[PDB]
Design a protein around this ligand. Structure first.
Ligand SMILES: Cc1cc2nc3c(=O)[nH]c(=O)nc-3n(C[C@H](O)[C@H](O)[C@H](O)COP(=O)(O)OP(=O)(O)OC[C@H]3O[C@@H](n4cnc5c(N)ncnc54)[C@H](O)[C@@H]3O)c2cc1C
Ligand SMILES: O=C1NC(=O)C2(CCN(C(=O)c3cc(-c4ccc(C5CCCCC5)cc4)nc4ccccc34)CC2)N1
Length: 255
């Protein structure tokens, strides 16, 4: 689905991240975990770059993307949006904020959307790899307030690894809101620096002991199936793949 829309707003967030807000076309349906390709003619007339929709589809007028400046195209879009926003602190009030025109193509699925059909799920992510899971956690919130107990999902074990403490700020509010509203203990939140967050859940330190974690989760849910969903580096995916075979957990090869 190709359409000419606009970044109507953006946050600048630690570790050179943009919280893009993009105007959602009337016809654009998506599921949590979906991504799209985005073209920004102001950056490159012809290049398309894929990004997770970090929002949940229950939010009604805007899509969110969280994009980290890691190289040429994201570095440029960061500088464009920083510069347009500076330009406005200095002299902006006259007319409302001008939207960055962008084209979007999607949505495109990942098997992560199957999380809502799983009984027990492990979500492991590194860095901005969190975004698909950000979308899924928000969607799970809306879906308990709306239709309680219509979800086969009984337990979500969440693990989010970060080199820099500041990066947890991207979704500290979401994690807080989940800590407040999860009386029934659907979620097991685990933040690793590779509380410190101001959450009830203490930020842990070092690489997790994945062997001990899988052993414990296997023990909790035997003899039922556990599904592992991963968004992160290949070195970790090799370890996780070996562990999913050892304990009988679902793995999708995505690295
Ligand atoms: C489904 C999907 C979802 C995604 N979701 C997100 C998301 O939500 N948020 C997000 O921030 N990103 C996301 N990404 C990544 C994103 O699509 C961007 O294209 C990419 O992160 C950066 O493009 P770029 O031009 O800025 O970087 P590039 O200039 O392409 O650089 C990319 C990386 O490779 C390195 N590199 C560049 N050139 C070389 C070279 N010659 N040799 C070795 N290494 C090199 C860079 O230093 C950097 O580490 C997603 C990707 C996919 C496939
Ligand atoms: O912040 C990070 N720390 C990391 O180690 C990385 C590596 C850069 N990463 C990605 O470029 C990336 C790839 C992917 C990705 C790439 C390919 C796939 C395909 C799916 C269909 C075929 C199988 C793999 C799926 C997901 N998704 C992301 C979602 C949000 C943020 C980043 C990504 C994620 C983890 N990012």
């Amino acid at each position: 689905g190709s359409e000419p829309t606009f970044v109507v707003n953006a946050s600048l967030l630690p570790s050179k991240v943009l919280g893009l807000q993009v105007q959602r076309p009337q016809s654009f349906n998506y599921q949590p975990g979906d991504y799209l390709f985005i073209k920004c003619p102001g950056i490159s007339k012809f290049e398309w770059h894929p990004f997770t929709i970090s929002s949940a589809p229950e939010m009604p007028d805007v899509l969110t993307l969280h994009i980290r400046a890691v190289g040429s195209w994201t570095g440029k879009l960061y500088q464009l949006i920083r510069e347009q926003r500076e330009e406005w602190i200095r002299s902006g009030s006259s007319q409302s904020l001008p939207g960055v025109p962008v084209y979007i193509d999607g949505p495109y699925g990942t098997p992560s959307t199957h999380i809502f059909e799983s009984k027990y799920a492990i979500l492991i992510c590194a860095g901005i790899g969190v975004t698909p899971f950000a979308s899924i956690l928000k969607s799970i919130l809306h879906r308990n307030q709306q239709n309680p107990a219509k979800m086969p999902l009984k337990k979500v074990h969440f693990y989010w690894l970060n080199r820099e403490q500041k990066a947890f700020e991207w979704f500290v509010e979401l994690l807080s809101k989940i800590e407040a509203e999860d009386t029934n203990n659907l979620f097991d939140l685990n933040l690793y620096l590779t509380l410190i967050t101001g959450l009830k859940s203490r930020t842990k330190t070092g690489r997790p002991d994945w062997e001990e974690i899988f052993k414990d989760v296997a023990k909790q849910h035997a003899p039922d199936n556990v599904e592992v969903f991963f968004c992160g580096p290949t070195g970790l995916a090799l370890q996780l793949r070996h562990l999913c075979t050892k304990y009988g957990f679902g793995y999708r090869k995505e690295n």
